[PDB]
């Protein structure tokens, strides 16, 4: 689990200022909450320039990411992070991602939530 993952992490980590910082977390597990929370990555893009021809916004970012993995745009971070992470997720998840840059039928971008109005919030 996530509890085991931080315990598996504790062998790998090599700084005592980190190991003490990880020790107090693992030691206080039964008394205190521990949750793993991801950071957001924001996909910056020109909306009207990119999403003009694509059918969906879900379809649109796929046609954006395939431009960047094959390739300076400020989404250069994300396609590094994908190839880094899919290197760690060794056999099944690297192949379908490498297959993703070929097949246009594929959508990597998929909705995690049921979408309602408005789609975008336009910042006054």
């Amino acid at each position: 689990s996530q509890m085991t993952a931080i315990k598996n992490l504790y062998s790998t980590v090599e700084d005592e200022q980190r190991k003490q910082l990880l020790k107090v977390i693992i030691e206080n597990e039964s008394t205190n909450d521990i949750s793993v929370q991801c950071p957001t990555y924001n996909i910056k893009l020109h909306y009207t320039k990119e999403c003009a021809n694509s059918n969906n916004i879900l379809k649109c970012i796929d046609e954006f990411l395939r431009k960047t993995c094959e390739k300076k745009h400020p989404s250069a971070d994300l396609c590094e992070h994908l190839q880094f992470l899919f290197e760690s997720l060794k056999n099944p998840y690297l192949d379908n991602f490498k297959k993703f840059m070929t097949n246009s039928d594929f959508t990597l971008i998929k909705p995690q939530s049921v979408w309602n109005v408005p789609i975008f919030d336009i910042y006054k």
């Binding site: 689990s1 996530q2 085991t4 993952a5 793993v36 909705p111 995690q112 939530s113 049921v114 309602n116």
Partner: protein, 33 residues
């Protein structure tokens, strides 16, 4: 609004369901040694 996704997380793999049942709650760790 929630959309039920396929459970494939680190805590949420099918492998992790069986692994946490493989080790029982050891009396050694609950003693804090």
């Amino acid at each position: 609004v929630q959309l039920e996704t396929s459970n494939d997380g680190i805590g949420y793999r099918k492998q992790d369901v069986l692994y946490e049942t493989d080790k029982p709650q050891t009396m050694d760790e609950a003693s804090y040694e």
